[PDB]
Design a protein around this nucleic acid. Structure first.
Lengths: 203, 80, 682, 77
RNA sequence: UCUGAGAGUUUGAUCCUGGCUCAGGAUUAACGCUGGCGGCAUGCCUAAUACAUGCAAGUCGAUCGAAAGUAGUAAUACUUUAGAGGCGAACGGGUGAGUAACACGUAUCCAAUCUACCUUAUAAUGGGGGAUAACUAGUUGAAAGACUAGCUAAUACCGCAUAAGAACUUUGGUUCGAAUCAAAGUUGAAAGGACCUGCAAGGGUUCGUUAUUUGAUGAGGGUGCGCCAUAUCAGCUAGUUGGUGGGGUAACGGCCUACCAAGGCAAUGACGUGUAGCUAUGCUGAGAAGUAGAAUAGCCACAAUGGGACUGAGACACGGCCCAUACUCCUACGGGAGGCAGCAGUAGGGAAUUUUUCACAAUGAGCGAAAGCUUGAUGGAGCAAUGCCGCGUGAACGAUGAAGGUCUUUAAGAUUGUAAAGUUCUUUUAUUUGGGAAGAAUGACUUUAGCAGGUAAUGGCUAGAGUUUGACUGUACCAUUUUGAAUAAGUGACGACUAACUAUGUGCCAGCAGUCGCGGUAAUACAUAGGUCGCAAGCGUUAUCCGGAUUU
């Protein structure tokens, strides 16, 4: 779902989080088991390579709030150019607008960044942007449409976040610039991307 | 027109006035985009001479454009 | 182009066999001086095809028939498409603004003119009186006027008088004007006036006394002139008659024999003069849709407003929607919207439909009635507005037919295409309902005599190419049999890969106090409890089909007196399988008695034709020994069986000349006699 | 729909009659030459058929074929 | 950098040959549940079945006579067409029944083909006659009209003469079945209109006529190779096969005809039969290949069925002509009118696939010198979750888990669940107010200046400015533009095949399913409840071809 509205269930079932860890704040029991009611001693019924491939696929996809058909479209465009497609998929996925928006320290979550972008609260190349499905190119800036610079959330979270090493920003004017491609060893990830590459058999 | 709705297209194509659009022809002279007009047109400037020298004068709507490019001046040299 | 004073929307609304069809036919014949009709000379060379009244009325009805006169062009409509109906004339008089009703002179009890007369009396729409029969037996003026005044009591004011007896009519009198002579026979094509002699001057004075004496309620200066004796001008007295007409309190009577076509043009002059113009009379005061139902009207202005009332179907074109243009001179070809249904109905061609052809006029003036082509989703009641004006719903009274005939076609595919056609027919012409009951599958239709179903089958077979034969009303009865003593239900078979067994003994007791209840009389536990609940349901699944034909067994108690099974055998289903078996056998012995649906019939009668009604009710197995009256009219209640009331509907209709209707309500189910149960099986 | 097709419907009939007349005199000259072969008949055929070949009745190919086949028998003397 | 996924099933167990299904993509697609939004794309696969109504190619008065009008005694300036005449109606537009064959596709040759109109130069645009429509008159009739006499005009028609060059035959130059180049005989051309300079004089200028000469364009013609199945189709064939002479085609040829003569093709599949629009390509596969040949484009085919022919450069002609046949419509019954496989639309069939729509603003075509006119081609609009794609139903804080469901069935506790209750932020979309472009600087028109064979001028070409053409649209986009999370979730599965489990009811019963098969008292496999997972504004369901499949 493009807007799930419930992420804690996915976090508990997958043991992962989009942030470092903020989806367990002791509001009751802090349990790392699966949500719902299926028995706390059961794990699953089928645990083959298909199961773990699917599990990692859902993890990677739901870490970005993307739909499966658009993911297949992205893979199809990835097959155009060649190289180390395993890390190239990550590099292209991170080039989406909201990903770099978080990497800019603008907003903690991609969902919040999408909400900001869609409602017309972002300017890029003197054109209004309403979708994060933009293939960012090296050497592009992003403005903030200073009328909407009065958003309390971005103003508060500009300093209290972490800036990725492959991006820069003059957060005083709240404008950032893409420096270079992202790297695997600089971002927090442990996903077996080979499973993602092998699973999709549409191509 | 050809191409895309609200984004028209018409290739500058060598053809004789006998058939419909987008069919049999002889040569592909070039193309013009009316969607962005800044006095520029894809013209070979050489094959158009051969097309003009064997009859089959182009579509009437391009005469001013060819005069802007400078093809009429060198084409009327025959009648000089 | 035209002045709204000239254009007029009138019509003829009268009972059949009183000349309504004939007078409309001949009026179109002799008034065809406009090329759309052109019947005056082009109907004499051709031979007029006379087939029936049904087909001619179906294919000649034109909601907009425009005729040209000296200055004023008229637009007429012939609404009555049945023996008599209330909602069709409701729509018509709601959209039209002129009523001409004829009086009977052959079967002069006036059955179906009185109904429309009372409707108009409650409607208060301008209406005039004319008589088709003048040169025929039983068609004298004095008896007619005396009878209508005595019975109806509407304060009519006849103005013109005939010359001669009811068969030697040879001249026409106008009370304020000269006398009309005749050069030829009918067709009234030559007009000339001559002075009046004493032999007519006496009646001129006599009837002018009544003419000007009653008009005293208008412009008292006329009363002063009558007191003085000075001659009163025609203009002022006719304006007073105009005021009376627009006030809907004065009703003049015309003369002429339209059956042999004497007195046509003077009728035109009288109706165009006495009746108001659609520009001087305010439009129909309808209630809007805002939360108040306030009265609104555009007064023939720019905003196009229209309420759908007639929707006919025709091949090669589609849906022809006869609607009234209350206001707005619109364009031929647009996209109007209706808010109550939220869909842009397409305006493709605004046409006038005539008897022999069609004519699509480019623009139609406000206050007119016309058809539109297309309109694929039109339902009667929607407001057609696209000039930024709120919608409206005019509703004062409506009626739905309850006279029911239960029939069935003779082929399955015939039934399918009949359903496909009747859904569209109900979508286009709401004048009846349709019911499908799960008894066997039957169309319970709403009719008005046999003629309604004849129109149904005609409009089906002539257009849709369908073969169909109507059926008889088929209904069921409930069942209840004698309380037995014992039954012997045995199940013996080696099947199912195991042992199948069951031994059931039940005394079956029907009750009329409560519904079904199961009683367990197995005290020793010889049968398991877990095997009881299914076979219970089996009886509950066998209470729908009896032992004779499947008649409904309703609210019957079951008490399992004795039973036995096999410890390692006797599969459970066999129990319920046996449950229907034994219940049949003893059920055959029980000889059940039926339970018929008894209903109540409320009939309002003027207490002058109650003999036939009471005799028919007595013949229909009812209890009648007197009357119960609502202090001025008798509304008799009768207990009736449903098995014979369907024919009784039309029997009562014909016995009372259609003057008395009724309403059906469900009373209860009552015990049957043996004369009903001997018909239970063939 | 169509408004001037009847113009061509009545136009061709008289022209067709004229062309039939030209063809008939051509055939008469050809038969006269076939009766006996001599220079004057061939010259008359030329003078009366070249005008027909000028206009659109008989193409010049058939005219050339006819005169070649006539001069063949003329030279067969 | 690039090229190949398996699993289940017959037996007590195992191996092996072999078959079936599932795990993949997809459409001319449909069904059931639903249901924000934009762009793009797509929308009779069946009945080549009939088709109501309107629209579907006309144009030229600067071609002609005749006829009306505006103002003007008259001359006249202009708008029009009933007709003649000229051009174009042979294009464009659709539909796939026949056709299994030089039809198509492909490379080619026409010592066998025309090519109006466009490009090149050239001999030139001489002179008369007779014509007939409209109109006038007379019959007939409801109109319809037709019939019969009279008058007219041309770029309509037919003669008179002049010819470079052509055509035709004799003589001589000359060719890898025929062609070049000389002299001669023979023979054929028309038509004017608009404008300028002039008193008249003539000349010039623009269109155009006729004989040419040039290419190009388009069409035709035969051959090489390739291009469905069937042997439960063995011989097929008589203008069929060939020579001679004639005719004829646009040309070459039994294409036709008179005589004469008797083979051609075949087992390497003729011939008969069944099926079928071919091709680029769509889809699948890595590929060899398989499948269908929807849009789109080229070709042929036909235009109610079947025969013919006239017209014109181009037809045997989608809406020209005649006839026959079937069908259908009107009629005052005298006689007529008609062909939606053109655009929408109607009937019927089928499960089923759109509105009886706005304009030539862009492009093309036809005519015209042009102002321009016709354009159901076309550009649009609209319907249609039919497909693809972006896009929303918000976002951030907020319990030892609010209430409650469910479970634990035994409460103690878990779960639904940061989801919610509540706090803050915000308006894609929504509602309201305003500004509001591009698509068209395209074509002409008019004033300026220049160019050209040229003149006294006027006309053609280029450079400059102004006039304008927008159906779409109040579109897009933005704007202290108002309000407020407000206006916005479904559908399949949860035994294994292939991802996620428990309770209750149901007792080989009700019932499930693509496969294994479950249910005879505990069903994780039925019904239902809670929870969970797989996709997503779609989700699943059956049918088609492909992969899996070395299962041709």
């Amino acid at each position: 779902m493009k807007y799930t509205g419930s992420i804690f269930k996915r976090s508990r079932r997958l043991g992962f989080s989009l942030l470092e860890n903020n989806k367990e704040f002791s509001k009751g029991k802090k349990r790392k088991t699966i949500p719902g009611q299926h028995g706390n001693r059961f794990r699953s019924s089928t645990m083959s390579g298909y199961a773990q491939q699917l599990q990692e696929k859902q993890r990677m996809q739901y870490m970005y709030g993307i739909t499966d058909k658009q993911f297949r479209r992205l893979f199809r465009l990835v097959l155009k150019q060649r190289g180390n497609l395993a890390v190239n998929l990550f590099r292209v996925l991170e080039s989406r607008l909201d990903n770099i928006v978080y990497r800019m320290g603008f907003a903690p979550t991609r969902r919040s960044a999408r909400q900001l972008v869609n409602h017309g609260h972002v300017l890029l190349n003197d054109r209004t942007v309403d979708t994060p499905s933009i293939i960012l190119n090296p050497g592009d800036k992003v403005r903030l449409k200073a009328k909407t610079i009065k958003i309390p959330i971005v103003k508060a979270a500009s300093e209290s976040g972490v800036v990725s090493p492959f991006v820069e920003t003059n957060n005083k004017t709240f404008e950032g610039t893409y420096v270079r491609f992202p790297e695997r060893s600089e971002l927090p990830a442990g996903i077996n991307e080979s499973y993602v590459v092998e699973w999709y058999k549409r191509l | 027109r050809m191409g895309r709705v609200h984004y028209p297209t018409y290739r500058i194509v060598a053809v004789d006035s006998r058939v419909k659009r987008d069919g049999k022809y002889i040569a592909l002279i070039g193309h013009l985009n009316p969607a962005l007009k800044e006095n520029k047109c894809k013209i070979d400037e050489a094959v158009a001479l051969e097309w003009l020298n064997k009859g089959a004068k182009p579509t009437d709507t391009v005469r001013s454009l060819f005069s802007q490019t400078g093809l009429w001046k060198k084409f009327v040299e025959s009648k000089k | 182009t035209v002045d709204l004073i000239n254009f007029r929307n009138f019509g003829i609304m009268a009972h059949i066999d009183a000349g309504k069809t004939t007078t409309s036919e001949r009026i179109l014949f002799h008034s065809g001086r406009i090329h759309k009709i052109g019947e005056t000379h082009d109907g004499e060379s051709v031979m007029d095809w006379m087939e029936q009244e049904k087909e001619r009325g179906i294919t000649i009805t034109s909601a907009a028939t425009s005729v040209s006169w000296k200055n004023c062009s008229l637009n007429l409509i012939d609404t009555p498409g049945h023996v008599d109906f209330t909602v069709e004339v409701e729509r018509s008089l709601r959209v039209l603004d002129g009523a001409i009703a004829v009086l009977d002179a052959q079967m002069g009890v006036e059955p179906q003119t009185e109904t429309v007369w009372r409707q108009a009396s409650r409607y208060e729409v301008p209406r005039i009186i004319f008589v088709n029969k003048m040169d025929k037996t039983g068609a004298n003026f004095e008896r007619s006027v005396q009878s209508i005044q005595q019975r109806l009591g509407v304060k009519a004011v006849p103005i013109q008088l005939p010359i001669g007896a009811e068969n030697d009519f040879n001249g026409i009198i106008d009370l304020i004007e000269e006398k009309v002579y005749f050069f030829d026979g009918g067709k009234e094509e030559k007009a000339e006036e001559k002075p009046i002699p004493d032999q007519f001057k006496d009646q001129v004075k006599q009837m002018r006394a009544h003419l000007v004496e009653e008009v005293a309620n208008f412009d008292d200066q006329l009363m002063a002139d009558y007191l003085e004796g000075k001659e009163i001008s025609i203009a002022d007295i006719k304006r007073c008659i105009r005021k009376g007409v627009i006030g809907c309190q004065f009703f003049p009577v015309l003369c002429g024999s339209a059956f042999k076509n004497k007195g046509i043009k003077l009728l035109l002059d009288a109706v165009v003069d006495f009746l108001p113009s659609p520009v001087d009379v305010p439009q129909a005061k309808a209630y809007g849709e805002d939360g108040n139902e306030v009265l609104i009207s555009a007064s023939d202005d720019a905003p196009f407003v229209g309420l759908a009332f007639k929707v006919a179907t025709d091949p090669f074109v589609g849906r022809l929607t006869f609607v009234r243009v209350y206001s707005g001179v619109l364009k031929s070809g647009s996209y109007v919207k209706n808010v109550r249904k939220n869909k842009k109905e397409r305006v493709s061609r605004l046409v006038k439909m005539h008897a022999q052809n069609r004519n699509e006029i480019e623009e139609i003036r406000a206050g007119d009635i016309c058809a539109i082509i297309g309109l694929k989703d039109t339902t009667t009641g929607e407001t057609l507005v696209d000039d930024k004006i709120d919608v409206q719903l005019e509703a004062m009274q409506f009626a739905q037919p309850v006279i029911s005939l239960a029939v069935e076609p003779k082929t399955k595919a015939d039934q399918e295409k009949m359903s496909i056609a009747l859904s569209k027919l109900a979508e286009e012409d709401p004048t009846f309902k349709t019911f499908t009951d799960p008894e066997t599958g039957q169309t319970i239709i709403a009719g008005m005599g046999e003629l309604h179903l004849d129109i149904l089958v005609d409009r089906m077979r002539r257009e849709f190419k369908v073969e169909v034969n109507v059926g008889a009303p088929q209904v069921s009865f409930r069942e209840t049999f004698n309380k037995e003593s014992e039954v012997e239900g045995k199940y013996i078979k080696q099947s199912g890969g195991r042992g199948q067994y069951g031994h059931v003994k039940i005394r079956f007791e029907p009750n009329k106090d409560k519904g079904f209840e199961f009683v367990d009389k197995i005290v020793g536990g010889r049968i398991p409890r877990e095997y009881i609940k299914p076979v219970q349901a089996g009886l509950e699944n066998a209470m729908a089909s009896g032992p004779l034909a499947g008649y409904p067994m309703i609210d019957i108690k079951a008490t399992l007196f004795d039973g036995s099974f096999h410890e390692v055998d006797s599969s459970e289903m066999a129990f319920k399988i046996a449950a229907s078996l034994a219940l049949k056998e003893a059920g055959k012995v029980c000889s059940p008695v039926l339970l018929e649906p008894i209903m109540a019939i409320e009939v309002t009668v003027p207490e002058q034709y109650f003999g036939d009604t009471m005799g028919d009710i007595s013949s229909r197995r009812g209890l009648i020994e007197g009357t119960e009256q609502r202090d001025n009219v008798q509304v008799i209640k009768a207990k009736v069986p449903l098995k014979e009331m369907f024919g009784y509907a039309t029997d009562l209709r014909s016995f009372s000349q259609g003057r008395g209707n009724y309403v059906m309500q469900f009373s209860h189910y009552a015990e049957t006699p043996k004369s009903v149960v001997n018909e239970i099986i063939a | 729909n169509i408004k001037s097709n009847e113009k061509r419907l009545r136009q061709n009939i008289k022209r067709n009659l004229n062309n039939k007349g030209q063809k008939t005199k051509l055939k008469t000259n050809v038969k006269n030459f076939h009766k006996e072969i001599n220079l004057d008949n061939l010259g008359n055929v030329y003078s009366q058929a070249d005008r027909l070949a000028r206009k659109g009745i008989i193409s010049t190919n058939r005219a050339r074929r006819l005169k070649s086949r006539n001069v063949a028998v003329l030279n067969k003397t």
